[PDB]
Design a protein around this ligand. Structure first.
Ligand code: CLA
Ligand code: CLA
Ligand code: CLA
Ligand code: CLA
Ligand code: CLA
Ligand code: CLA
Ligand code: CLA
Ligand code: CLA
Ligand SMILES: CCCCCCCCCCCCCCCC(=O)OC[C@H](CO[C@@H]1O[C@H](CS(=O)(=O)O)[C@@H](O)[C@H](O)[C@H]1O)OC(=O)CCCCCCCCCCCCCCC
Ligand SMILES: CC1=C(/C=C/C(C)=C/C=CC(/C)=C/C=C/C=C(C)/C=C/C=C(C)/C=C/C2=C(C)CCCC2(C)C)C(C)(C)CCC1
Ligand code: SF4
Ligand code: SF4
Lengths: 94, 165, 31, 35, 41, 74, 74, 80, 731
């Protein structure tokens, strides 16, 4: 931008004249411990592929069906529980 | 009797309605003096109610099962059973007065349309001319029929602007 | 005589086949 | 009703699994750049 | 005086006066001839 | 002009004097309608031998707080 | 509108009422504290319950309020 | 990208050009009117569709017409 | 960014609008890229197949759910003391009181009470067990799959029908009148004679034994010999019990007329006879147009010959055959108008002449069916006029229709619109004036001053049908009149017995309230028609926009120039007419529901006295019948009506939400969205996430469509909830 004065436009430095700044980014490779980082990158080894990561989400879909067919009954959900008596209605109906 | 309707004179519901209205008015009147302003007003209302019911029963109006007057809107049916004053005669009266006002307005608009500045004549009405045209509008049926048979009451379709289809 | 479970299963399978035909028709319509 | 367990599995499938799958697929398809 | 009569002849003044006169005439007709349900002549 | 109309109506078509003697049972009223087409039914039995429309502007309370007492003052 | 509705219901359920040496008998019986937490309560216990006074005013002094109530709706 | 068209009914008053907020119209020489000039739309890609040019045309009917079509980042007036 | 595969211009849109318009223009095949007439017709044909399959699947699902979780078998034994079950309820959000409150018709758990009347219909056509319903559902499933395969097959080059095949109007009409209408009616008659009639007499006739059961004691001999009268020897006795053999008969083609004393519905033999006569007439009509057998008619010549002399109608109907055959919108508009009118006819005939057993006793089902069909008819009518406008702006050719009825009707469109406006103004002025006059006299405590005009014309027509409640003694009201003596021993006995009874809806008694409400209905119809006709006639252009046809059927506007051009397209006219259609249908349904509410409770005086003024409509109908509905759930508990109360509030919310899109316009939202975009582009952490499509405000036309959709949905949901809750909590 060459903003050394009141010039905020520069074709040779057009990158700085459009406000393309990281503002808060900072490159630094010294932080996470090597032993802990290895454990996590190892745990999430093949889970970096779209098909494989979607498979993990597919497990959540199976859990949803598992809850309806088993989880809902184990938490004693009112819909899966029993019913007590009934009513007749306005007139002589059921 | 026209369509299963009973005359209000022999209608029991009509008499019961009149009795109930007068009874309510007397109940309200009982909470006042004999010559005070509210008492006189209530007595006047009672007299008006009785006169209205008597007039409706005497005029030959037809009452239904609910005891309220019903109007017959059909020529012939109302003319042969004495109910022409229900809708027929009022129709004639309206048509006449409505045509009177409409014809007066039409004549005023056509008369001021020939002036050099008609818009001002429309926002600032000419009272003498409007009065004269209002008086002339009473003969609107004759004038309208004469203009229709004369051909001056209509504008040629070829002279009226129209959309480009 | 209420419908049995096998009847519901058969109806669901036939519905699956119908859905397959429907998706085929939809694919043909998209083209 | 026969097979009381069927609604408990079909309702979540049609209301939770199917809608999520359909929305994800539609979102991925309406922004493909080259279909 | 001419300008005053011209102002009195404007559309709003004439409209309000005409409506007032018609309303007054109708009110007095109903005051002297009340409950006129049908045209009894 | 509006204030003058309010005071005039409270002095000629109201029950303020009667309301002063019984402010807990007499309902304030400052409007009277003419009998033309059955509208006289709007003249409610507010109290104190008076018939009119019940008002909710609070003028009676204001006048009482100011010590009006009489209709001549209004 | 919501402000005035809140004020009306609150005063009719927790302030305005009568004293009978045994307590306070509010106009609506204090249903605001148990029904104002839902929209259905506002529609039924306030709009529907309190509207019976204006829809049943025909034939009385408040008939005008019943007429305007409809006219305004128009 | 809207479609802007100029018709021979134009009188070359140049009002539409002055009313354009994105500089889409211009006056070019012509010989069908007393003004000896006609309007043109060489930069329709910058037209937003405000129709300000039509509100300034005095001919009846309008000599300049704008037909809104495919919307772009410029025709939608988006600054983000 | 290329999802609108059918619109390359829309795919280039970098905003979210691309997605929106990508879904609202998916069925406008004529506007898609690289679209021809042959491909358009083929795509429409395949879409028709898909729609047919969807309808079959829907019917199969209804049958399966009734046979799996309903109480059809129990309802058959007690059709008057058991509430039909629609389907089960499996909602994890339900609480214990909700689960216990929704268990009604002897079900194992929470269920929904049916309101569509499928129970009465299936019971009247012969169905009795759950196995039959399951078999029907499976059959419909197979039929749907077959239609899907047909739709896919006709899309292949070897089975693709040519464009000329779609234009063969004579052949299509011949096959539709003789086969789609006649043969279908004949088959229905066969089913009624072989199953419905025997089943109603306590005799079971199914696929396993229909070949060993005689529909009539004298099988086929009287039919081929000509002694058709032998098929109406002894009909069902007046003391016959449905589904049993007491007081039964052997006739299969009667014409008693009226209603069954026990079921309060039309006789099955009468309906079978009706379908047989209809089938014969339709087949005969089907043998009219010319195909490839040297005989028949040519519609083009018939139209070209319908030119009255003196030039009163101009060129007559010259070129109309091509105008209808070439334009798909013209045919769609005609079909929609006819279908909507038939829907209204169906709604008006099912309540006055119940065709299903024990249907008149189900007050909830009758009201729901009438309201449903009336709303469907209104929407279809609006669509018919909308497509007529689309035709005028996209398929009308002035040179091809020069001098015919279309050009002439367009030549005097001003007179048409002017007279429609005058009729609407007259009806509105007087209906509102009479209602307000009655309201004012009622408020002042003087009901005797009400203007109650007796509907003498409608009463006269009723007397012409046999009603003797008005003392007219006209045609059917006089026993010595020629029409009375002609049908004295045919259908008049039952017809008169049913029309002179106040226990049914066959020509109900009318009074001043009916007069006022009918004029209000006339108002709604006239104004809706005025809006639609004005939009269709002015679609090509008006004085404010002479070249409107150049901008298409739908466009936002024409800018603020020339005084302003908001809502100037034909689409906008249809948009404004939808509100009026909803209002008219609302008035019609309100009238029907209130009258039947008073009739069912044996209190016709309530409607006869409170319907003459609007306060009675608001207090004695809306406020009075809303107590149970709004009490579905309260701080004390909940009942089975809580679903309707929630739907009531839901409809109110949707309607109010639509009010936003209707009142607020695009300008405020665009600036607001720009501010939101700036906020997102400047918020840390969230900067890592970007939008693929630039967020923009809804389009003007899109906003009008969204607002109208919300308004209509809220309207329908609110009325449905109120109607069902009011007529269900009492009966
Ligand atoms: C606005 C539409 C309208 C309608 C629906 C009716 C309907 C009716 N009119 Mg009527 N009428 C009308 C306009 C109308 N009228 C007008 C404008 C006039 C003035 C010319 C009349 C003058 C009239 C007379 C003089 C009579 C009727 C009579 C009748 C009744 C029996 C006549 C009939 O219809 O037989 C069939 C009609 C055919 C054309 C055949 C009937 C209910 C008769 C009656 O009172 O019943 C006893 C009677 O005599 N009308
Ligand atoms: C259009 C007809 C239709 C409709 C509206 C419904 C509606 C319903 N069904 Mg049902 N069903 C149908 C047809 C239909 N069904 C048919 C023909 C069968 C026979 C196989 C079944 C078998 C069936 C079973 C076994 C169950 C339901 C259940 C249900 C309820 C919960 C939905 C669910 O999760 O189940 C899933 C539904 C299916 C797996 C099959 C339905 C397939 C239909 C035909 C698809 C139709 C799509 C439609 C034509 C296209 C519209 C476009 C749209 C998808 C955007 C719900 C009220 C459940 C229930 O009882 O709730 C308590 C339940 O367990 N249905
Ligand atoms: C500024 C507000 C105001 C308002 C809203 C009203 C309203 C009303 N006044 Mg009132 N009035 C007001 C100010 C107001 N007044 C003032 C300042 C005075 C003192 C001069 C009066 C003195 C007054 C009297 C003496 C009377 C009313 C009456 C009335 C009622 C009927 C009026 C009518 O229709 O007469 C007729 C309508 C006309 C158009 C004719 C008016 C002709 C006058 C002379 C025009 C004067 C300019 C009405 C509700 C009457 C009443 O209460 O009935 C019981 C009544 O008799 N007013
Ligand atoms: C006998 C021969 C025959 C038959 C049976 C049919 C039948 C049919 N054709 Mg076809 N057609 C034919 C010959 C035939 N066609 C020929 C020769 C040609 C070339 C000229 C065509 C060209 C053609 C085209 C281009 C199209 C069709 C279409 C259709 C379908 C119409 C839509 C529909 O299903 O609604 C059913 C209609 C009825 C059942 C009749 C309606 C009766 C009224 C309106 C209903 C009320 C009756 C009653 C009161 C209802 C009560 C029931 C209630 C209790 C539920 C239909 C199944 C359309 C289609 O959908 O494609 C698949 C279509 O696009 N046809
Ligand atoms: C046989 C019936 C039929 C057929 C075949 C068509 C066919 C067609 N119509 Mg049409 N129409 C019909 C009936 C029909 N219409 C009816 C009954 C109406 C009155 C409502 C209309 C009104 C109408 C208009 C105004 C227009 C068309 C247009 C069109 C064309 C394009 C449609 C389109 O773009 O798809 C797109 C489909 C959609 C956008 C779906 C709409 C979304 C719906 C309304 C929302 C429903 C939400 C749901 C109810 C919410 C449930 C509530 C719950 C959540 C609580 C097309 C050829 C357009 C046209 O011709 O272009 C020039 C056009 O502008 N139609
Ligand atoms: C309650 C709401 C309401 C009302 C009263 C109207 C009324 C009317 N509409 Mg409308 N409409 C509405 C809602 C409403 N609409 C909505 C929500 C929409 C969707 C946006 C539409 C869309 C619509 C369209 C597209 C059209 C109409 C048309 C009409 C007119 C039809 C002619 C008629 O019926 O004569 C009767 C007239 C009336 C009932 C008006 C009442 C007359 C007043 C009360 C008399 C005045 C007395 C008094 C002096 C009042 C003045 C007091 C003041 C000075 C203080 C009419 C005036 C059509 C039209 O213009 O017709 C030519 C038309 O094309 N409407
Ligand atoms: C007593 C109370 C009352 C009131 C307050 C009104 C008020 C009104 N009426 Mg009405 N009317 C009434 C009673 C009443 N009417 C009765 C008892 C009848 C007999 C059934 C009618 C029949 C009637 C008709 C036929 C019409 C009205 C119309 C109108 C409206 C305009 C009237 C007018 O003159 O405008 C000003 C006048 C003009 C602008 C020009 C004159 C127009 C008049 C009406 C034509 C008269 C001559 C013509 C040849 C008559 C033939 C009409 C044709 C249909 C046969 C207006 C709001 C008109 C309307 O509804 O507007 C759409 C309308 O045409 N009324
Ligand atoms: C009942 C009708 C209705 C509703 C619901 C809204 C709602 C809203 N309006 Mg609005 N408005 C309306 C009528 C309505 N308006 C009308 C008639 C007008 C014309 C004058 C306007 C004019 C208007 C303006 C000018 C503005 C708004 C703004 C807003 C938004 C304010 C933000 C907010 O409230 O937070 C939250 C939203 C809500 C509380 C709405 C209800 C949402 C529920 C509680 C959540 C439910 C979750 C859902 C069920 C779960 C998903 C289920 C799945 C099936 C999808 C909001 C969404 C302002 C805005 O843009 O926002 C700052 C704005 O400036 N409105
Ligand atoms: C209904 C459908 C259900 C579908 C189920 C899909 C499941 C995912 C799957 O198969 O992935 C297939 C991938 C293939 O990877 C592949 O793994 C290969 C090795 S092997 O084939 O797995 O041996 C390797 O060579 C290759 O690089 C890699 O891509 O395998 C994985 O890496 C899955 C490992 C998952 C480990 C994380 C589990 C969750 C941890 C939660 C932590 C806290 C919990 C407390
Ligand atoms: C716009 C448009 C369109 C559309 C249209 C429409 C929508 C229409 C309609 C309409 C309608 C909706 C109609 C209806 C009707 C009806 C009628 C016309 C009737 C009648 C009558 C009669 C004849 C009857 C008789 C009888 C009998 C039979 C017996 C008994 C008695 C009586 C009398 C009832 C189109 C595309 C086409 C064209 C262009 C544009
Ligand atoms: S519509 Fe607006 S931007 Fe486009 S040419 Fe006209 S004035 Fe210029
Ligand atoms: S405003 Fe119209 S007349 Fe003037 S230069 Fe532009 S196109 Fe021509």
């Amino acid at each position: 931008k060459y903003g050394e004065e009141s010039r905020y436009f520069d074709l040779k430095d057009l990158e700085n004249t459009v406000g393309s700044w990281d503002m808060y980014g900072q490159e630094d490779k010294s932080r996470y411990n090597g032993l802990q980082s290895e454990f996590f990158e190892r745990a999430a080894n093949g889970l970096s592929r779209r098909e494989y990561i979607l498979g993990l989400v597919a497990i959540g879909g199976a859990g949803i069906l598992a809850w309806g067919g088993k989880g809902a009954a184990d938490v004693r959900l009112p819909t899966v529980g029993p019913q007590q008596p009934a009513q007749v209605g306005p007139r002589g109906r059921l | 009797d026209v369509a299963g309707l009973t005359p209000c004179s022999e209608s029991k519901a009509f008499a019961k309605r009149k009795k109930n209205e007068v009874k309510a008015l007397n109940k309200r009147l009982k909470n006042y003096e004999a010559d005070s302003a509210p008492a006189l007003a209530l007595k006047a209302t009672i007299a008006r109610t009785e006169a209205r019911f008597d007039k409706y029963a005497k005029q030959g109006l037809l009452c239904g099962t609910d005891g309220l007057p019903h109007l017959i809107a059909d020529p012939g049916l109302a003319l042969r059973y004495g109910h022409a004053g229900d809708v027929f005669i009022p129709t004639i009266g309206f048509i006449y007065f409505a045509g009177w006002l409409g014809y007066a307005g039409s004549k005023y608009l056509q008369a001021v349309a020939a002036t050099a500045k008609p818009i001002e004549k429309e926002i600032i009405i000419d009272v003498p001319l409007a009065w004269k045209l209002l008086w002339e509008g009473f003969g609107w049926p004759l004038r309208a029929f004469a203009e229709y048979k004369n051909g001056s009451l209509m504008e040629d379709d070829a002279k009226i602007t129209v959309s480009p289809r | 005589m209420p419908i049995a479970d096998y009847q519901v299963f058969t109806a669901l399978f036939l519905a699956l086949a119908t859905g397959i035909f429907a998706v085929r028709l939809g694919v043909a319509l998209y083209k | 009703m026969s097979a009381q367990f069927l609604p408990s599995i079909l309702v979540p499938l049609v209301g939770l699994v199917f809608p999520a799958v359909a929305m994800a697929s539609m979102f991925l398809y309406i922004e493909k750049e080259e279909i | 005086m001419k300008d005053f009569t011209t102002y009195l002849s404007t559309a709003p003044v004439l409209t309000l006066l005409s409506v007032t006169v018609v309303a007054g005439l109708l009110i007095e007709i109903n005051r002297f001839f009340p409950d006129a349900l049908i045209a009894a002549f | 002009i509006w204030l003058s109309g309010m005071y005039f109506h409270g002095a000629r078509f109201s029950n303020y004097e009667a309301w002063l003697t019984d402010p807990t049972h007499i309902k304030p009223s400052a409007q009277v309608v003419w009998p033309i087409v059955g509208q006289e039914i709007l003249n409610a039995d507010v109290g104190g031998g008076f018939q009119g429309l019940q008002i909710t502007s609070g003028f009676f309370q204001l006048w009482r707080a100011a010590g009006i007492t009489s209709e001549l003052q209004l | 509108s919501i402000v005035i509705f809140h004020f009306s219901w609150k005063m009719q359920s927790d302030v305005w009422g009568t004293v009978s040496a045994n307590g306070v008998s509010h106009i609506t019986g204090g249903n605001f504290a148990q029904s104002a937490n839902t929209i259905n309560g506002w529609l039924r216990d306030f709009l529907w319950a309190q509207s019976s006074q204006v829809i049943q005013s025909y034939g009385s002094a408040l008939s005008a309020y019943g007429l305007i109530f409809l006219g305004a709706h128009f | 990208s809207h479609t802007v068209k100029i018709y021979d009914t134009c009188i070359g008053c140049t009002q539409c050009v002055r009313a354009c907020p994105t500089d889409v119209l211009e006056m070019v020489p012509w010989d069908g009117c007393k003004a000896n000039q006609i309007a043109s739309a060489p930069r329709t890609e910058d037209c937003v569709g405000c129709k300000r040019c039509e509100s300034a045309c005095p001919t009846d009917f309008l000599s300049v017409r704008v037909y809104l079509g495919s919307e772009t980042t410029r025709s939608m007036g988006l600054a983000y | 960014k290329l999802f609108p595969k059918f619109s390359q211009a829309l795919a280039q849109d970098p905003t979210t609008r691309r997605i929106w318009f990508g879904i609202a223009t998916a069925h406008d095949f004529e506007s898609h890229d690289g679209m021809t007439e042959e491909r358009l017709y083929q795509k429409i044909f395949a879409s028709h197949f898909g729609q047919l399959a969807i309808i079959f699947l829907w019917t199969s699902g209804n049958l399966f759910h009734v046979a799996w979780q309903g109480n059809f078998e129990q309802w058959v034994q007690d059709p008057l003391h058991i509430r039909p079950i629609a389907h089960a309820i499996w909602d994890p959000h339900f609480g214990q009181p909700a689960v216990e409150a929704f268990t009604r018709g002897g079900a194992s758990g929470p269920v929904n009470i049916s309101t569509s009347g499928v129970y009465q219909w299936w019971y009247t056509i012969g169905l009795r067990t759950n196995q039959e319903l399951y078999t029907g559902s499976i059959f419909l499933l197979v039929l749907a799959a077959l239609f899907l395969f047909a739709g896919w097959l006709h899309l292949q080059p070897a089975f693709q029908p040519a464009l000329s095949w779609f234009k063969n109007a004579e052949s299509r009409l011949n096959h539709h009148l003789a086969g789609l209408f006649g043969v279908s009616s004949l088959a229905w008659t066969g089913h009624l004679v072989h199953v419905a009639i025997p089943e109603s007499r306590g005799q079971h006739v199914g696929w396993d034994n229909f070949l060993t059961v005689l529909p009539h004691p004298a099988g086929l001999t009287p039919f081929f010999t000509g002694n058709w009268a032998a098929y109406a020897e002894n009909p069902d006795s007046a003391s016959h019990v449905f589904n049993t053999a007491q007081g039964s008969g052997t006739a299969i083609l009667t014409f008693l007329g009226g209603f069954h004393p026990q079921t309060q519905s039309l006789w099955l033999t009468d309906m079978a006879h009706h379908h047989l006569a209809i089938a014969v007439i339709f087949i005969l009509a089907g043998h009219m147009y010319r195909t490839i057998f040297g005989i028949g008619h040519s519609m083009r010549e018939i139209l070209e010959a319908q030119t009255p002399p003196s030039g009163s109608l101009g060129a007559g109907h010259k070129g109309l055959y091509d105008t209808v055959n070439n334009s798909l919108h013209f045919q769609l508009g005609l079909a929609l108008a006819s279908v909507g009118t038939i829907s209204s006819l169906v709604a008006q005939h099912m309540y006055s002449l119940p065709p299903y057993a024990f249907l008149a006793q189900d007050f909830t089902t009758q009201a729901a069916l009438y309201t449903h069909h009336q709303y469907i008819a209104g929407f279809i009518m609006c669509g018919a006029f909308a497509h007529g406008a689309i035709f005028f702006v996209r398929d009308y050719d002035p040179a091809q229709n020069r001098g015919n009825v279309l050009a002439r009707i367009l030549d005097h469109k001003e007179a048409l619109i002017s007279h429609l406006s005058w009729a609407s103004l007259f009806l509105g002025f007087h209906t509102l004036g009479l209602y307000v006059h009655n309201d004012v006299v009622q408020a002042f405590g003087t009901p005797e001053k009400q203007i109650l005009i007796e509907p003498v014309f409608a009463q006269w027509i009723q007397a012409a049908h046999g009603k003797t409640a008005y003392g007219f003694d006209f045609l059917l009201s006089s026993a010595t009149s020629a029409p009375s003596l002609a049908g004295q021993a045919l259908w008049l006995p039952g017809w008169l017995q049913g029309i002179n009874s106040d226990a049914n809806s066959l020509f109900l008694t009318i009074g001043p309230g009916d007069f006022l409400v009918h004029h209000a209905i006339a108002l709604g119809l006239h104004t809706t028609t005025l809006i639609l006709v004005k939009g269709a006639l002015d679609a090509r252009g008006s004085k404010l926009m002479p070249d409107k046809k150049d901008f298409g059927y739908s466009f936002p506007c024409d800018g603020p120039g020339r005084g302003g051009t908001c809502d100037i397209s034909a689409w906008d006219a249809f948009y404004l007419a939808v509100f009026w259609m909803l209002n008219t249908i609302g008035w019609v349904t309100f009238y029907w529901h209130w009258k039947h509410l008073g009739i069912w409770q044996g209190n016709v005086n309530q409607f006869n006295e409170s319907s003459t003024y609007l306060m009675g409509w608001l207090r004695d109908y809306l406020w009075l019948n809303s107590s149970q509905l709004i009490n579905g759930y309260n701080p004390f508990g909940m009942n089975s009506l809580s679903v309707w109360a929630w739907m009531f509030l839901f409809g109110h919310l949707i309607y109010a939400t639509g009010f936003m899109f209707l009142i607020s316009w695009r300008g405020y939202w665009q600036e607001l969205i720009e501010t939101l975009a700036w906020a997102h582009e400047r918020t840390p952490l969230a900067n890592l996430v970007r939008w693929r499509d630039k967020p923009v405000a809804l389009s003007i036309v899109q906003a009008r469509l969204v607002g109208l959709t919300h308004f209509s949905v809220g309207y329908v949901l609110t009325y449905a909830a109120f109607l069902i809750a009011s007529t269900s909590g009492k009966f």
